[PDB]
Amino acid sequence: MQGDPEVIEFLNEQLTAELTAINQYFLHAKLQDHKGWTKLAKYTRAESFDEMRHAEVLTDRILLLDGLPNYQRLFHVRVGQSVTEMFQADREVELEAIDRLRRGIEVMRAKHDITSANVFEAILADEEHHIDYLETQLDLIEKLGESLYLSTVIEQT
Amino acid sequence: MQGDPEVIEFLNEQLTAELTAINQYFLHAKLQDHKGWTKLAKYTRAESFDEMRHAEVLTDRILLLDGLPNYQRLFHVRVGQSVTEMFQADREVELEAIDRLRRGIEVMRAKHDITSANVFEAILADEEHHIDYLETQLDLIEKLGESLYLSTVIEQTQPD
Amino acid sequence: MQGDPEVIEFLNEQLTAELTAINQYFLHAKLQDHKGWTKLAKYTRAESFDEMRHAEVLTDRILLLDGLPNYQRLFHVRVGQSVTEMFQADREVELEAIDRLRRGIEVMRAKHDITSANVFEAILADEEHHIDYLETQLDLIEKLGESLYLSTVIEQTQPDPS
Amino acid sequence: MQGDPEVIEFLNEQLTAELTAINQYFLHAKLQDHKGWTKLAKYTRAESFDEMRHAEVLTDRILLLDGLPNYQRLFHVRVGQSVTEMFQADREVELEAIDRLRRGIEVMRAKHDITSANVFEAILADEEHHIDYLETQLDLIEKLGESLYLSTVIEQTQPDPS
Amino acid sequence: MQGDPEVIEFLNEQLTAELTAINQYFLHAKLQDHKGWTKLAKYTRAESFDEMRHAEVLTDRILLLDGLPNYQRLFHVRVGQSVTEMFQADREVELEAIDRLRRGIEVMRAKHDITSANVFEAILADEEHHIDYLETQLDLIEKLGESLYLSTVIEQTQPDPS
Amino acid sequence: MQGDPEVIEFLNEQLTAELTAINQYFLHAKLQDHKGWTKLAKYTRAESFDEMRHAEVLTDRILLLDGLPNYQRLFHVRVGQSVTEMFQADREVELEAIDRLRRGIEVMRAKHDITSANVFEAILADEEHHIDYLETQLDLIEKLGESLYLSTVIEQTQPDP
Ligand code: HEM
Ligand code: HEM
Ligand code: HEM
Ligand SMILES: [Fe+2]
Ligand SMILES: [Fe+2]
Ligand SMILES: [Fe+2]
Ligand SMILES: [Fe+2]
Ligand SMILES: [Fe+2]
Numbered sequence: 001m002q003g004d005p006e007v008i009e010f011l012n013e014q015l016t017a018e019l020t021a022i023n024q025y026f027l028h029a030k031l032q033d034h035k036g037w038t039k040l041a042k043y044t045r046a047e048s049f050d051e052m053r054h055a056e057v058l059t060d061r062i063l064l065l066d067g068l069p070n071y072q073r074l075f076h077v078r079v080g081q082s083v084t085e086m087f088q089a090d091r092e093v094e095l096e097a098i099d100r101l102r103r104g105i106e107v108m109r110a111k112h113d114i115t116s117a118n119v120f121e122a123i124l125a126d127e128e129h130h131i132d133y134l135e136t137q138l139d140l141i142e143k144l145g146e147s148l149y150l151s152t153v154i155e156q157t
Numbered sequence: 158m159q160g161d162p163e164v165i166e167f168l169n170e171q172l173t174a175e176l177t178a179i180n181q182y183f184l185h186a187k188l189q190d191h192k193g194w195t196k197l198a199k200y201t202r203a204e205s206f207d208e209m210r211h212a213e214v215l216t217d218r219i220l221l222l223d224g225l226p227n228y229q230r231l232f233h234v235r236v237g238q239s240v241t242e243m244f245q246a247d248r249e250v251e252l253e254a255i256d257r258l259r260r261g262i263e264v265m266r267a268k269h270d271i272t273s274a275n276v277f278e279a280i281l282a283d284e285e286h287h288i289d290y291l292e293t294q295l296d297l298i299e300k301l302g303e304s305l306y307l308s309t310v311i312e313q314t315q316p317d
Numbered sequence: 318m319q320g321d322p323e324v325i326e327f328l329n330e331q332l333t334a335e336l337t338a339i340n341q342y343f344l345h346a347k348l349q350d351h352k353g354w355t356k357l358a359k360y361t362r363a364e365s366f367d368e369m370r371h372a373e374v375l376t377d378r379i380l381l382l383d384g385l386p387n388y389q390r391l392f393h394v395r396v397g398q399s400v401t402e403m404f405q406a407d408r409e410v411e412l413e414a415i416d417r418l419r420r421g422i423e424v425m426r427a428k429h430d431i432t433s434a435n436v437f438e439a440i441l442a443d444e445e446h447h448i449d450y451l452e453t454q455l456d457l458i459e460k461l462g463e464s465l466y467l468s469t470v471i472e473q474t475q476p477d478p479s
Numbered sequence: 480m481q482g483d484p485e486v487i488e489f490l491n492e493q494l495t496a497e498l499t500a501i502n503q504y505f506l507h508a509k510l511q512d513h514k515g516w517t518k519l520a521k522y523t524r525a526e527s528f529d530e531m532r533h534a535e536v537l538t539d540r541i542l543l544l545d546g547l548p549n550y551q552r553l554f555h556v557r558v559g560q561s562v563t564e565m566f567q568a569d570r571e572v573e574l575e576a577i578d579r580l581r582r583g584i585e586v587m588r589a590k591h592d593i594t595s596a597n598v599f600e601a602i603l604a605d606e607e608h609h610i611d612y613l614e615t616q617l618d619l620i621e622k623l624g625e626s627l628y629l630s631t632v633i634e635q636t637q638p639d640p641s
Numbered sequence: 642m643q644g645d646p647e648v649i650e651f652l653n654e655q656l657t658a659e660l661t662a663i664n665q666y667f668l669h670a671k672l673q674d675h676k677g678w679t680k681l682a683k684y685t686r687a688e689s690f691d692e693m694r695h696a697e698v699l700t701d702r703i704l705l706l707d708g709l710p711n712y713q714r715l716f717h718v719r720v721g722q723s724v725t726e727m728f729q730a731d732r733e734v735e736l737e738a739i740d741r742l743r744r745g746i747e748v749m750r751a752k753h754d755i756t757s758a759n760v761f762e763a764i765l766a767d768e769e770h771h772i773d774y775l776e777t778q779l780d781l782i783e784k785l786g787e788s789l790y791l792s793t794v795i796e797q798t799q800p801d802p803s
Numbered sequence: 804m805q806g807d808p809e810v811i812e813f814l815n816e817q818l819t820a821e822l823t824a825i826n827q828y829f830l831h832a833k834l835q836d837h838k839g840w841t842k843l844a845k846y847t848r849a850e851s852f853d854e855m856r857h858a859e860v861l862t863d864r865i866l867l868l869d870g871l872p873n874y875q876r877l878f879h880v881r882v883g884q885s886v887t888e889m890f891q892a893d894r895e896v897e898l899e900a901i902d903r904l905r906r907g908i909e910v911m912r913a914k915h916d917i918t919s920a921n922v923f924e925a926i927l928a929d930e931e932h933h934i935d936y937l938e939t940q941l942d943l944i945e946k947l948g949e950s951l952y953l954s955t956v957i958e959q960t961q962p963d964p
């Protein structure tokens with residue numbers, strides 16, 4: 001079996017993108033744990049684990065399609081100091097991931113490929129859930145207050 | 158099998174330092190528990206027991222080298238009224254402990270002694286972890302405010 | 318709710334005394350363990366822990382009275398080379414403790430304070446038991462002979478199995 | 480507490496090196512598993528997780544010293560077709576890491592910093608063990624023959640129940 | 642990769658020393674057991690096994706560096722009739738080992754080699770503990786008297802783990 | 804109660820031989836484990852422990868008879884590069900031990916001492932079993948080939964299950 005070059009390019013772009021997502025999420029989790037916000041650190045660690053589960057599925061698929069996975073390059077990684085910056089950065093990265101996923105799903109469905117379309121659909125659903133959570137947390141922080149939101153997450157054990 | 162007098166005096170000085178730390182930490186734990194800040198009291202108790210382990214291993218080591226540990230003299234022990242003063246006091250005390258530990262490690266390693274250097278290294282790592290915790294707690298209380306942090310640490314769950 | 322200064326000073330003196338006893342007992346236990354005598358080492362460790370409970374309850378009580386405990390002052394600490402010197406030193410320490418406890422109990426009960434008198438009574442009973450043990454051990458070693466006496470505490474005879 | 484830039488840059492270089500090792504090891508594990516050789520895939524997975532722990536410890540230490548870990552820089556990642564190429568690439572990576580680790584521990588111990596030296600020592604021991612394993616495996620395959628060596632690592636079974 | 646001859650010869654000398662210690666300790670344990678002194682025999686057996694572990698780890702380390710372990714030559718092994726001679730012989734061999742270990746770790750650390758230095762530190766700590774035990778036992782028998790000391794190790798073991 | 808010098812010297816030289824045997828066997832086991840042949844390493848370790856138990860019982864018997872065991876002298880220890888050299892060295896050691904054992908048991912039984920003869924018989928049986936195993940392993944290596952035998956004996960220390 002030989003896949004089209006376009007679907008290989010789409011899969012490689014997704015792989016690179018969520019490798020970048022992995023690096024960003026793990027760094028943010030470490031920073032939050034260092035600052036003393038334990039529960040946020042646990043949630044971010046879980047999110048990173050889910051993300052590179054996605055990455056493993058993607059590389060397995062592209063390897064099955066008789067291609068060369070790309071591990072050398074990665075996109076830009078951004079970091080923030082306050083919680084708002086981290087939330088906004090994650091929002092933007094998963095947003096562009098969602099847009100690329102939709103475009104790739106359409107093209108791959110048109111190109112008589114099905115299984116890769118299904119894995120793209122599953123990834124899209126997971127990213128949608130994540131961005132929903134991020135938006136909820138952002139508006140909660142905006143309504144409540146930075147100090148109160150930080151106080152309700154401190155553990156000190 | 159006798160050791161050098163300089164390493165013995167270094168060990169004695171560190172023993173006195175961690176004994177003073179023991180006393181200060183226990184007093185602060187009792188004072189915090191009196192006012193109702195339960196979680197801080199538990200953490201301070203645990204830290205006092207850690208400094209106890211420091212002191213016990215240190216006196217065992219100096220006694221092995223045919224020395225005379227002194228349990229007589231103490232350094233100045235300071236107390237605070239609010240949380241910031243006690244945090245600052247602990248920070249400064251094991252800050253100077255860290256400095257003395259580094260200098261002693263260098264001299265002792267240069268003087269052809271290894272095991273004492275190793276126990277000094279372990280103690281140094283522990284004190285570095287503790288001062289990191291103190292600094293992050295100080296930054297947290299500075300950002301949040303005294304009332305909010307105190308409310309976070311309040312338990313009020315006494316059985317009766 | 319404020320206590321009289323005399324009661325506070327009595328509590329502080331007793332706290333200092335039991336802290337000094339803590340230090341002396343722990344040092345003696347460590348020295349005996351290093352020498353090679355084990356049963357004496359564990360018994361001295363237990364006694365040090367008992368005096369540590371003494372100190373904890375004392376500081377709790379004085380703190381309840383809106384007082385200020387002091388952890389700076391410390392009495393003279395004495396050490397010995399042979400077993401007899403250690404026994405005599407501990408005997409003298411707890412003797413002084415007993416005398417101070419009796420005087421404080423009398424004054425404190427005379428000045429309308431009961432709970433502190435009760436904790437002093439409990440501490441006095443414990444100190445009396447300890448000094449009784451010290452005296453009987455000293456008589457035993459004097460009768461038996463030093464070498465023959467300490468031939469008993471030391472042992473390597475696989476005590477782990479049971 | 481503050482750290483001088485030399486220790487920070489040494490730790491950052493080691494962090495990037497271990498990240499590159501993570502990527503290369505996992506890619507090789509996936510490739511070997513796809514080819515049909517299973518035990519090699521399991522061993523490579525374990526090695527990738529070990530380097531993963533290394534990286535986590537390194538970034539924790541960097542953050543403790545009030546530094547700025549970087550997750551952007553990445554070294555060159557190389558891949559191979561036959562088993563010999565993979566083993567040679569891993570051997571080169573480990574050799575470079577060992578040399579850098581030795582230079583770094585020397586420099587940072589000469590400037591009064593001990594804990595960082597200790598974590599460097601632990602990492603150095605682990606990478607030394609790994610390169611020893613790679614060398615002995617390479618000697619084994621060179622002596623035995625490629626096909627005969629591969630015949631002992633393949634297995635045919637359904638999805639393994641873990 | 643490959644080590645310089647100096648570290649190799651240091652490790653070989655230490656290996657020979659620990660082999661000689663193994664032989665001497667086991668012979669002393671057997672002789673003590675034959676005479677009826679029980680606990681001394683099992684303590685010496687435990688010491689023999691500890692030196693066995695020392696030799697094994699040293700052999701692994703030297704073999705890692707592409708060297709040739711020396712299992713042929715031995716130093717001088719000495720025996721004693723009474724307990725004092727055995728204790729003094731063990732003290733002598735431990736002192737020699739301690740001095741050689743210190744010189745070796747200094748030289749090895751001064752030439753960019755850390756892991757072997759760490760194994761030397763571990764061995765040094767263990768032998769220091771052993772010589773401390775020997776010294777305190779010698780002082781104890783000197784104070785107590787040979788016959789009275791021997792009377793406390795003859796019997797009364799009763800090992801019943803269950 | 805003390806025995807004759809001849810039996811004690813026989814026992815002493817047998818003790819020296821067994822000590823040399825355990826040294827050689829342990830060194831060979833370490834070399835084989837380092838090279839990557841795990842199962843051979845396990846078998847060699849078991850054999851070394853067996854011979855070193857032999858040495859323990861022999862020195863116990865020597866001490867019972869009011870003698871002086873010697874732990875100072877040693878015989879020549881030989882090492883090999885490939886499997887064939889190791890097997891041949893072990894075979895030679897066992898052959899020498901068997902010959903000495905037979906001569907010693909005959910001589911010492913002819914002089915009214917049977918318990919030492921019995922321990923010699925037990926050791927003789929054990930060493931005979933060992934040399935039989937070595938011979939059959941050498942025959943297998945000759946029949947199959949150096950590479951095929953090693954491919955059979957190697958294993959991957961995955962430790963991930
Ligand atoms: C990029 C930097 C990453 C770091 C530092 C990291 C960190 C970790 C850590 C600390 C563990 C647990 C190790 C333990 O508990 O002993 C783990 C587990 C795991 N990681 Fe990540 N992670 C990263 C991204 C990745 C990567 C690169 C992979 C590669 C496949 C991945 C997939 C997994 C999987 C499958 C597990 C096991 C989870 C399970 O068995 O349920 N994640 N990771
Ligand atoms: C000043 C020298 C001190 C020494 C040598 C010392 C020694 C010890 C040791 C070794 C333990 C055992 C802890 C464990 O096994 O986890 C212990 C427990 C304890 N310490 Fe300290 N400590 C000291 C300071 C203090 C002081 C001044 C107090 C005052 C009250 C104190 C209160 C306690 C208590 C309440 C315990 C628990 C006792 C028990 O569980 O029975 N400590 N001490
Ligand atoms: C030279 C005369 C020796 C005598 C009389 C002797 C005696 C013994 C005996 C009877 C055992 C019990 C074995 C078992 O229960 O399976 C033992 C333990 C052991 N022996 Fe020796 N042995 C000698 C030399 C050696 C040497 C040089 C080594 C080198 C490594 C060695 C390796 C071991 C090991 C690894 C153990 C077990 C230790 C453990 O499990 O942690 N033997 N010794
Ligand atoms: Fe994602
Ligand atoms: Fe401390
Ligand atoms: Fe008392
Ligand atoms: Fe690594
Ligand atoms: Fe040793």
Ligand SMILES: [Fe+2]
Nearest residue numbers: 821854857930
């Ligand atoms: Fe044998």
